[PDB]
Design an enzyme around this catalytic site. Structure first.
Site, PDB file in Angstrom:
ATOM      1  N   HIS A  69       0.851  -1.222   0.000  1.00  0.00           N
ATOM      2  CA  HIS A  69       0.000   0.000   0.000  1.00  0.00           C
ATOM      3  C   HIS A  69       0.874   1.255   0.000  1.00  0.00           C
ATOM      4  CE1 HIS A  69      -3.207  -2.910   1.194  1.00  0.00           C
ATOM      5  NE2 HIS A  69      -3.834  -2.202   0.269  1.00  0.00           N
ATOM      6  N   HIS A  73       1.799   1.650  -5.747  1.00  0.00           N
ATOM      7  CA  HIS A  73       0.399   1.175  -5.829  1.00  0.00           C
ATOM      8  C   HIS A  73      -0.533   2.346  -6.217  1.00  0.00           C
ATOM      9  CE1 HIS A  73      -3.360  -0.749  -4.823  1.00  0.00           C
ATOM     10  NE2 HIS A  73      -3.594   0.171  -3.909  1.00  0.00           N
ATOM     11  N   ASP A 108      -5.133   5.562  -1.110  1.00  0.00           N
ATOM     12  CA  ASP A 108      -4.543   4.807   0.038  1.00  0.00           C
ATOM     13  C   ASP A 108      -3.598   5.708   0.860  1.00  0.00           C
ATOM     14  OD1 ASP A 108      -5.612   2.131   0.260  1.00  0.00           O
ATOM     15  OD2 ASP A 108      -4.383   1.517  -1.446  1.00  0.00           O
ATOM     16  N   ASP A 218      -8.117  -0.914  -8.297  1.00  0.00           N
ATOM     17  CA  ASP A 218      -7.464  -1.229  -7.006  1.00  0.00           C
ATOM     18  C   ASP A 218      -6.891  -2.655  -7.039  1.00  0.00           C
ATOM     19  OD1 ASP A 218      -6.542  -0.570  -4.517  1.00  0.00           O
ATOM     20  OD2 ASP A 218      -8.417  -1.042  -3.503  1.00  0.00           O
TER      21      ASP A 218
HETATM   22  C1  LIG Z   1      -4.179 -10.216  -5.592  1.00  0.00           C
HETATM   23  N1  LIG Z   1      -4.847  -9.265  -4.715  1.00  0.00           N
HETATM   24  N2  LIG Z   1      -5.017  -7.919  -5.031  1.00  0.00           N
HETATM   25  C2  LIG Z   1      -5.619  -7.318  -4.046  1.00  0.00           C
HETATM   26  C3  LIG Z   1      -5.872  -8.253  -3.048  1.00  0.00           C
HETATM   27  C4  LIG Z   1      -6.543  -7.922  -1.786  1.00  0.00           C
HETATM   28  O1  LIG Z   1      -7.438  -8.649  -1.375  1.00  0.00           O
HETATM   29  N3  LIG Z   1      -6.100  -6.800  -1.137  1.00  0.00           N
HETATM   30  C5  LIG Z   1      -6.682  -6.304   0.081  1.00  0.00           C
HETATM   31  C6  LIG Z   1      -7.804  -5.290  -0.231  1.00  0.00           C
HETATM   32  C7  LIG Z   1      -6.458  -4.809   0.318  1.00  0.00           C
HETATM   33  C8  LIG Z   1      -5.346  -9.475  -3.479  1.00  0.00           C
HETATM   34  C9  LIG Z   1      -5.367 -10.773  -2.783  1.00  0.00           C
HETATM   35  O2  LIG Z   1      -4.427 -11.520  -2.962  1.00  0.00           O
HETATM   36  N4  LIG Z   1      -6.424 -11.080  -2.011  1.00  0.00           N
HETATM   37  C10 LIG Z   1      -6.592 -12.283  -1.319  1.00  0.00           C
HETATM   38  C11 LIG Z   1      -7.881 -12.593  -0.828  1.00  0.00           C
HETATM   39  C12 LIG Z   1      -8.141 -13.718  -0.146  1.00  0.00           C
HETATM   40  N5  LIG Z   1      -7.148 -14.624   0.056  1.00  0.00           N
HETATM   41  C13 LIG Z   1      -7.126 -15.817   0.739  1.00  0.00           C
HETATM   42  C14 LIG Z   1      -5.843 -16.293   0.639  1.00  0.00           C
HETATM   43  C15 LIG Z   1      -5.325 -17.513   1.305  1.00  0.00           C
HETATM   44  C16 LIG Z   1      -3.949 -17.661   1.539  1.00  0.00           C
HETATM   45  C17 LIG Z   1      -3.435 -18.742   2.258  1.00  0.00           C
HETATM   46  C18 LIG Z   1      -4.341 -19.640   2.778  1.00  0.00           C
HETATM   47  C19 LIG Z   1      -5.707 -19.481   2.577  1.00  0.00           C
HETATM   48  C20 LIG Z   1      -6.197 -18.411   1.888  1.00  0.00           C
HETATM   49  N6  LIG Z   1      -5.105 -15.379  -0.030  1.00  0.00           N
HETATM   50  C21 LIG Z   1      -5.878 -14.360  -0.388  1.00  0.00           C
HETATM   51  C22 LIG Z   1      -5.578 -13.164  -1.087  1.00  0.00           C
HETATM   52 MG   LIG Z   2      -7.308   0.895   0.306  1.00  0.00          MG
HETATM   53 ZN   LIG Z   3      -5.502   0.396  -2.925  1.00  0.00          ZN
END
Ligand SMILES: Cn1ncc(C(=O)NC2CC2)c1C(=O)Nc1ccn2cc(-c3ccccc3)nc2c1
Ligand SMILES: [Mg+2]
Ligand SMILES: [Zn+2]
EC number: 3.1.4.17
Length: 316
Positions: A69, A73, A108, A218
């Site tokens: 962040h 970004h 952000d 985003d």
């Molecule tokens: C690519 N990207 N861009 C923005 C976001 C985002 O959400 N950002 C927040 C908004 C600021 C993501 C993201 O990667 N999001 C996520 C969302 C859910 N997950 C669950 C698991 C998981 C891991 C290990 C074990 C089990 C589950 N990993 C994730 C990643």
């Molecule tokens: Mg934000």
């Molecule tokens: Zn953002």
């Protein structure tokens, strides 16, 4: 005589028009890249160059040295908005072009790498000030503080009523980046599109479309070429895992994505995120704004990459 035009090297001049453009590792080039995008998407007379430059540098100074962040970004999200605006140029107003690149740059401001949930559990003062969309209300408040610095009113030529309109576009666009609000927003838009009730002359509908555009911008790491997508995920988890450590310090079990001990489940977590959030986001956006198709195509290409990782044909 406003004959000072921003130019980019030949590769950047061509590739910045692509949705999957990466802004590169040279931080000192990002202000120029942003001005270039404002001049082409808004016009060379939208802002006084001196005030816009002073504004950009104060915004940069109020981003923190966090893994994801950060200032990069901010400019990355602004670039995705640039590409949406340039490929849909007949659909937006003068105030929307002025407001939306600024909203993306600022969306952000002063992020410390912690979610709204962590600030609530920590009992951070911000959670008392702003009970919902805690960080997003903070980002907007930081945007207003910067616009009110001496020599930083980039909207100085607007009437009181126009200034108020552009600040309201910015406020709603920044609040829309609270992913908790996206689920409801996308459902409403999908419903409005499938019943043929969606109306871009309706301000409350425009607000929802801009909100979804903000989500799309985003989350745009999922719309880059695979190597960019994969490397950006490292910075995202660096933040998630630091928050998980902080949750453990409060005596609270973190959610799985924030637990560094669950590292081996990241590919399946990504697959879950693409299926539940990203693919539906870019699908609904493409229905509303068909020229945004390359975002959906790149997101599907990355979904297939994460499936290859899960099958052990790729390593992460
Ligand atoms: C690519 N990207 N861009 C923005 C976001 C985002 O959400 N950002 C927040 C908004 C600021 C993501 C993201 O990667 N999001 C996520 C969302 C859910 N997950 C669950 C698991 C998981 C891991 C290990 C074990 C089990 C589950 N990993 C994730 C990643
Ligand atoms: Mg934000
Ligand atoms: Zn953002």
């Amino acid at each position: 005589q406003g004959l000072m035009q921003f130019t980019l090297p030949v590769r950047l001049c061509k590739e910045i028009e692509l949705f999957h453009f990466d802004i590169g590792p040279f931080e000192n080039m990002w202000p120029g890249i942003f001005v270039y995008m404002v001049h082409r998407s808004c016009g060379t007379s939208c802002f006084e160059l001196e005030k816009l430059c002073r504004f950009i540098m104060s915004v940069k100074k109020n981003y923190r040295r966090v893994p994801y962040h950060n200032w990069k970004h901010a400019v990355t999200v602004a670039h995705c908005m640039y590409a949406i605006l340039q490929n849909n140029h007949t659909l937006f107003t003068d105030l929307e072009r002025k407001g939306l690149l600024i909203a993306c740059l600022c969306h952000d401001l002063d992020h410390r790498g912690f979610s709204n949930s962590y600030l609530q559990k920590f009992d951070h003062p911000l959670a008392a000030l702003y009970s919902t969309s805690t960080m997003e209300q903070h980002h907007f408040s930081q945007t207003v503080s910067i616009l009110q610095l001496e020599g930083h009113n980039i909207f100085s030529t607007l009437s009181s009523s126009e200034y108020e309109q552009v600040l309201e576009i910015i406020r709603k666009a920044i609040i829309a980046t609270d992913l908790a609000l996206y689920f409801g927003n996308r459902k409403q838009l999908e419903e409005m599109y499938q019943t043929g009730s969606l109306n871009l002359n309706n301000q409350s509908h425009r607000d929802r479309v801009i909100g979804l555009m903000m989500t799309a911008c985003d989350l745009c790491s999922v719309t880059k070429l695979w190597p960019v997508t994969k490397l950006t995920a490292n910075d995202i988890y660096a933040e998630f895992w630091a928050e998980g450590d902080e949750m453990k310090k409060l005596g609270i079990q973190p959610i799985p994505m924030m637990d560094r001990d669950k590292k081996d489940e990241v590919p399946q977590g990504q697959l879950g995120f693409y299926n539940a959030v990203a693919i539906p986001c870019y699908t609904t956006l493409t229905q509303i704004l068909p020229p945004t198709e390359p975002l959906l195509k790149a997101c599907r290409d990355n979904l297939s990459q994460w499936e290859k990782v899960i099958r052990g044909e790729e390593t992460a």
